[PDB]
DNA sequence: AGGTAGTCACAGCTGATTGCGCTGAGGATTAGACGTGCGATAT
DNA sequence: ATATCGCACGTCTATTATCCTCAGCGCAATCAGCTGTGACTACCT
């Protein structure tokens, strides 16, 4: 098995970390998205891949961290880049991520999923073992441009106006964390930060061949048991095999 | 006096049933005029 | 030598767009029914 989707619900503290628009400024949730990342960090070298879901909500997220003495904790494990709108800024801080993750030093990319260096590069092996996902990657609905749609498709198709947000959701939450098994000798992991994601109206979003590797047994398992899974998962995947 | 049929300590399965998670809308929560004050200046 | 203008030093008031608690429909917790294993207890002809 080349891949180990993962579906992590409440953190160690049995709080949910799902990325709800009412609990975004809240403590407790983003104490757990950074206690996540802490040993996440320590035990898949070489490559992390984070998606958040909107430059806004990543500008406070890393300000939350830096405020507490948590971000530190990571800083002297993997270098945190953390890609811009500006493309000239982005292509040197991923010049960066690249010789960072060739050598041992391990760097953490972040982003925002639907964002141009999503799906503008593809994360070969020993490149982004690991794809983390903060919460349901939804849309913003602002702008009176979605709604719009939202209404033609309800009246013409009739489309669930929960349900397309719900597959625009997942499709971009899919492909980009659909970008770390690049070959047959490729291998990465998979998480999601979210207890949205354990429920089975979005696992069925997730493209076949990674629905039976997603196991039930780990939907809502937490950050620590999370560790422990990835640890005995990338321990196994270094053993040689045969073509 | 002999044989067996319920019967209760668990366990499993099945078919349903109903019960809460999915967000989102209508109602309660410190810089200009106005003075002074002070210091450099007309009669 | 004493009132008078420039400069400064504040202070009161405001010509004007924020955060809480009630709604169907689908996936999951719940339950009645039935049965399987083992020994037990007893009862009629």
Redesign the pocket.
Known sequence: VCLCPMIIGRGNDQVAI?S???TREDIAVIRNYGNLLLEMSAVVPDGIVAFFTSYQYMESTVASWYEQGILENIQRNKLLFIETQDGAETSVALEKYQEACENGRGAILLSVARGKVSEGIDFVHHYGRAVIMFGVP?VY?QSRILKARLEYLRDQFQIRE?DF?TFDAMRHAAQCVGRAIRGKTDYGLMVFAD??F????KR?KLPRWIQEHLTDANLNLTVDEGVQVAKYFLRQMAQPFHR
């Not at 354990?198 to 109206?201: I, K, L, M």
Request: net charge positive; aromatic share 14%; no cysteine.
């Open positions: 799902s709800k628009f009412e939804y609905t929960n947000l207890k949205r354990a429920r089975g109206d069925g």
